[PDB]
Coordinates of C-alpha atoms (C1' of nucleotides) in Angstrom, one line a residue:
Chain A
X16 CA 0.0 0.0 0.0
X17 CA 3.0 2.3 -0.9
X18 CA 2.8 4.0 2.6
X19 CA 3.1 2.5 5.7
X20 CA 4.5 2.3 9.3
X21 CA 7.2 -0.3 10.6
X22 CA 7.2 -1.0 14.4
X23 CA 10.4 -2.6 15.8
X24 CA 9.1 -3.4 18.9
X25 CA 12.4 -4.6 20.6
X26 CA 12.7 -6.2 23.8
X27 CA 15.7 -8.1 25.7
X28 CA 14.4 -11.4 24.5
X29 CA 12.3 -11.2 21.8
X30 CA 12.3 -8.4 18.9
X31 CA 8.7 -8.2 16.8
X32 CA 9.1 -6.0 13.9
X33 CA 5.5 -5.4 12.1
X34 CA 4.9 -3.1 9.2
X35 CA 1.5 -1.7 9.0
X36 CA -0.4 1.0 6.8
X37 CA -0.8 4.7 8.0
X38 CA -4.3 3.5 10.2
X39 CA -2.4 0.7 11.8
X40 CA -4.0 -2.3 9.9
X41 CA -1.2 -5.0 10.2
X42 CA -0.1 -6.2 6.4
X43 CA 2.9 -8.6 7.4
X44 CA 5.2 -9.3 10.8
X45 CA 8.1 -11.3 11.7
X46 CA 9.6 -12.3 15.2
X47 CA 13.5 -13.5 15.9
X48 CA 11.8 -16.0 17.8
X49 CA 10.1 -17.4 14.8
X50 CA 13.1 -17.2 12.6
X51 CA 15.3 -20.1 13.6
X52 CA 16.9 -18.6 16.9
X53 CA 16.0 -19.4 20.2
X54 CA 16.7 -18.9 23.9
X55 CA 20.5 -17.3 23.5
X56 CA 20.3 -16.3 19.7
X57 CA 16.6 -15.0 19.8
X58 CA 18.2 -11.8 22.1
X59 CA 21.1 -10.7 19.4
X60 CA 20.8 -7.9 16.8
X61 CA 21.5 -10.6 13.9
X62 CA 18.0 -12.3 14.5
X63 CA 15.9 -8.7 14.5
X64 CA 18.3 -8.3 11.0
X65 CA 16.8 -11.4 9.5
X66 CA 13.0 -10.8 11.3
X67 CA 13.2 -7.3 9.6
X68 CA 13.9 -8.5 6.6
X69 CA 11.7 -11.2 6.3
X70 CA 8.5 -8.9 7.5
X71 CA 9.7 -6.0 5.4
X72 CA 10.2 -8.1 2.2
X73 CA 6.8 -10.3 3.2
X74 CA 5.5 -6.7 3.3
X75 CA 6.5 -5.6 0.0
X76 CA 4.0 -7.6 -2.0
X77 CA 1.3 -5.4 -0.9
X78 CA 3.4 -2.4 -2.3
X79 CA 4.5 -0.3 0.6
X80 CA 8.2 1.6 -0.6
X81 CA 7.9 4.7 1.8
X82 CA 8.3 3.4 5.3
X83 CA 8.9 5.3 8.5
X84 CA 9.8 3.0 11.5
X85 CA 8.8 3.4 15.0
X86 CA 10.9 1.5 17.5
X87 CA 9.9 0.8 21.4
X88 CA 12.0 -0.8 23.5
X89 CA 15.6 -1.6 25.0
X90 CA 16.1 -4.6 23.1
X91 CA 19.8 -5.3 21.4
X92 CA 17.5 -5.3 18.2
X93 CA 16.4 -2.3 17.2
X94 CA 19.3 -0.9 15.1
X95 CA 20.0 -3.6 13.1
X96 CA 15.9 -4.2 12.2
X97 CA 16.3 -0.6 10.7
X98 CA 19.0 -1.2 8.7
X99 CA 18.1 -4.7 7.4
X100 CA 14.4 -2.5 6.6
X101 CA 16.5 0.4 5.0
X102 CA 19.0 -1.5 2.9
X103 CA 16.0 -4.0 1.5
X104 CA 14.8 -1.3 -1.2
X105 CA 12.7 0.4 1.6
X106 CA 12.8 4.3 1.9
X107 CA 12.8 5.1 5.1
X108 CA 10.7 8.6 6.1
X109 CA 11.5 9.5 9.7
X110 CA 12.9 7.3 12.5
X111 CA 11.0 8.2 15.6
X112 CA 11.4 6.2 19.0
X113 CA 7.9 5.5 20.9
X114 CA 8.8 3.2 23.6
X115 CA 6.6 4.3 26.8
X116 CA 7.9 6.0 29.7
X117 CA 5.7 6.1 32.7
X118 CA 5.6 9.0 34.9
X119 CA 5.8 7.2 37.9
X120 CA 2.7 5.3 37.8
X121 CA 3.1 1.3 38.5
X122 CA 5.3 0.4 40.7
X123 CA 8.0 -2.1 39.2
X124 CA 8.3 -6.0 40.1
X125 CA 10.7 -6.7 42.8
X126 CA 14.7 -6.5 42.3
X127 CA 16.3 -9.9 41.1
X128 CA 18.2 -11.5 43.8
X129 CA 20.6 -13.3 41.5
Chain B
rG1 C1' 46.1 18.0 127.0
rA2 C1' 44.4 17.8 121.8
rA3 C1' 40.2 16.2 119.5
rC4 C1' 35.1 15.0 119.5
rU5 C1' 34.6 17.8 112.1
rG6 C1' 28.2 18.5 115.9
rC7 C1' 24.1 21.3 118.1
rA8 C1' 22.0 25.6 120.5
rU9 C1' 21.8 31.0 121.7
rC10 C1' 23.6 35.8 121.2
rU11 C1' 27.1 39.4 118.7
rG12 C1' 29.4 41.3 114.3
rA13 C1' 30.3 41.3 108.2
rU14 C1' 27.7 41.7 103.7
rA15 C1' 31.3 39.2 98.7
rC16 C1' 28.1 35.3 97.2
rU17 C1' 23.3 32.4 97.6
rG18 C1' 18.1 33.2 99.9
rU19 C1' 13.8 37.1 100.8
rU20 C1' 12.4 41.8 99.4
rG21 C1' 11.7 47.7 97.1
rA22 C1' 13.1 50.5 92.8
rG23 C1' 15.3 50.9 88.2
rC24 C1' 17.9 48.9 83.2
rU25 C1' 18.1 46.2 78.5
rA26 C1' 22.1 42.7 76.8
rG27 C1' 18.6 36.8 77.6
rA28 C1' 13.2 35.9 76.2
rG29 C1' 8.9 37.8 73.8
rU30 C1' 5.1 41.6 71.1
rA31 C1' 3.3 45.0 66.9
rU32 C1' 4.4 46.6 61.9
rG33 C1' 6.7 45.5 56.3
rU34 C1' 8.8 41.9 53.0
rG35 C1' 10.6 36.5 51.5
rA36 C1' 11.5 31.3 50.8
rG37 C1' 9.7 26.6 51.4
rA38 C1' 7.8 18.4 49.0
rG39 C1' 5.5 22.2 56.6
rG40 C1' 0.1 20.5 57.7
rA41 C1' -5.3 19.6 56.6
rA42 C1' -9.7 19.4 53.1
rG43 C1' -11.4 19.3 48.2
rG44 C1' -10.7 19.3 42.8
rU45 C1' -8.1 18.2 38.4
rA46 C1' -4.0 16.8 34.4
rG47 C1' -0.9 13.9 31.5
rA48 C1' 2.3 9.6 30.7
rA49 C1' 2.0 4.3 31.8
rU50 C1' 0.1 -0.4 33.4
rU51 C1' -4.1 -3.8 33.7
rC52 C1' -8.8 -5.2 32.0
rC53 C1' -13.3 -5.0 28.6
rA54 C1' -15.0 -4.5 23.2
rG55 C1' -13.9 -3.9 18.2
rG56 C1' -10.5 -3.4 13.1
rU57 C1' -5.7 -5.5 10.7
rG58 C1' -3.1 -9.9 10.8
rU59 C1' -0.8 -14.9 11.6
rA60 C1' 2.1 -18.5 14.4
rG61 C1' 4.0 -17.7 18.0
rC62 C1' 4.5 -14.8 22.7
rG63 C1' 6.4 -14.7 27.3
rG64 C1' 10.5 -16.0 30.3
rU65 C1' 15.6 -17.6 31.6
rG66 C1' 22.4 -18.5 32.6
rA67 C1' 19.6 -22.2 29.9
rA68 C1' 14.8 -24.1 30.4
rA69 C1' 10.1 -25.2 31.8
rU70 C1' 5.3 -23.8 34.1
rG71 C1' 2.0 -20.0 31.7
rC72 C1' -0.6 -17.6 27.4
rG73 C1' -1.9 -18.7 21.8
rU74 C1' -5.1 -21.4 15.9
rA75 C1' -11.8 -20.9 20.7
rG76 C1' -6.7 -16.3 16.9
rA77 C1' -2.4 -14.8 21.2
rG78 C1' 1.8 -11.5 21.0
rA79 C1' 2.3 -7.1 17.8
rU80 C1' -0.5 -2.6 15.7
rC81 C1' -4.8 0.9 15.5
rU82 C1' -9.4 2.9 17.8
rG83 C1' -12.8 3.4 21.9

RNA sequence: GAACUGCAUCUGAUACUGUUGAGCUAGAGUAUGUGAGAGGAAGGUAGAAUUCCAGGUGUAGCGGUGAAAUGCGUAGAGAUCUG
């Protein structure tokens, strides 16, 4: 659909990159955990490469060239999704960073006692 | 003989303590002007976020860990958008 939105929603373990149209109707996605790695390989920046790639090119039969990307999250992930999106024939917009921030509101699970 | 550091009663002194008369302002307070503050109490309200509920897109994973597994998901999760 020419125009549409990637979201690299990267995390420590997983990274979940989904490209969408402008009104946020899903067209195709692709996890690291789905891609072959898992448990120690699933949290490296190689595996959001090859889930960016497969959801960006798995995108591209619907049509979508101009692409901004939206990434959330501390994840190791979240560089390398942009360039595997970027240097797949995608032309990337804006890179804007929407990971939520509370201002103070929850209070955060206990400290691990490793 | 000395001592018995004691008690009593008179006499004398007034530096200090006690009791009193008067005065003073330096300790302590009062009135008046400004100022800072997450000081307190009662109400109201804002925005980020989480969780849940209901929908749209969408499909095979999500989540988690040192690795796993329990758990969640094809009854459609997770992700994304809107209420």
């Amino acid at each position: 659909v020419s125009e549409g939105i990637a979201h690299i929603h990267a995390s420590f373990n997983n990274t979940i990159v989904t490209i969408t149209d402008r009104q946020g109707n899903a067209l195709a996605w692709a996890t690291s955990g789905g891609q072959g790695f898992r448990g120690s390989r699933k949290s490296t920046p190689f595996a959001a490469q090859v889930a960016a790639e497969v959801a960006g090119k798995a995108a591209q039969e619907y049509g979508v060239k101009n692409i901004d990307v939206l990434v959330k999250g501390p994840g190791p992930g979240r560089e390398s999704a942009v360039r595997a999106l970027g240097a797949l024939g995608y032309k990337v917009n804006s890179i804007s960073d929407v990971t939520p921030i509370p201002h103070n509101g929850c209070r955060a699970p206990k400290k691990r006692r490793v």
